[PDB]
Amino acid sequence: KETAAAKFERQHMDSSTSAASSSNYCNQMMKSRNLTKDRCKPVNTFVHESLADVQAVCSQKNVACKNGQTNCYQSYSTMSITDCRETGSSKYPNCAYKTTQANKHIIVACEGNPYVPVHFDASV
Ligand SMILES: [Rh+2]
Ligand SMILES: [Rh+2]
Numbered sequence: 001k002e003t004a005a006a007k008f009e010r011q012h013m014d015s016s017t018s019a020a021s022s023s024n025y026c027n028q029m030m031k032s033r034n035l036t037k038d039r040c041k042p043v044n045t046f047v048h049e050s051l052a053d054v055q056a057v058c059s060q061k062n063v064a065c066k067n068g069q070t071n072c073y074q075s076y077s078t079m080s081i082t083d084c085r086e087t088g089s090s091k092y093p094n095c096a097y098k099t100t101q102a103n104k105h106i107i108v109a110c111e112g113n114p115y116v117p118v119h120f121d122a123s124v
Contacts, residue, residue: 004111004118011035012120013054014046019080019101026084026097040086040095045120047106048080054117058110065121071109072121078103081123 035041065072090096104123
């Protein structure tokens with residue numbers, strides 16, 4: 001089916017835009033990436049960097065993951081990102097999000113061979 005690596009790309013990668021297309025960005029992107037299908041995914045981050053640059057983080061600063069696993073990695077350089085956060089008045093199926101652009105270090109969890117991002121842990 002959909003690999004963990006492909007799922008990370010669907011849920012977290014948006015290399016096409018340098019920053020959050022618009023105030024509508026999260027409303028459109030959360031739906032189109034199928035993060036609103038079964039429920040409103042409450043929070044989700046999209047990264048506006050090349051796939052190779054995000055895959056390279058698996059080789060960068062090793063940090064503890066929030067769940068206590070050891071396989072998380074923080075980017076040495078800041079990256080362009082968009083945080084999506086479901087609004088207090090959002091009601092499934094009409095999932096509503098606030099769109100916020102940032103330039104932060106990302107923290108991803110990496111797994112497999114090849115060793116690639118499979119979850120988005122945090123930005124700092
Ligand atoms: Rh820094
Ligand atoms: Rh700094």
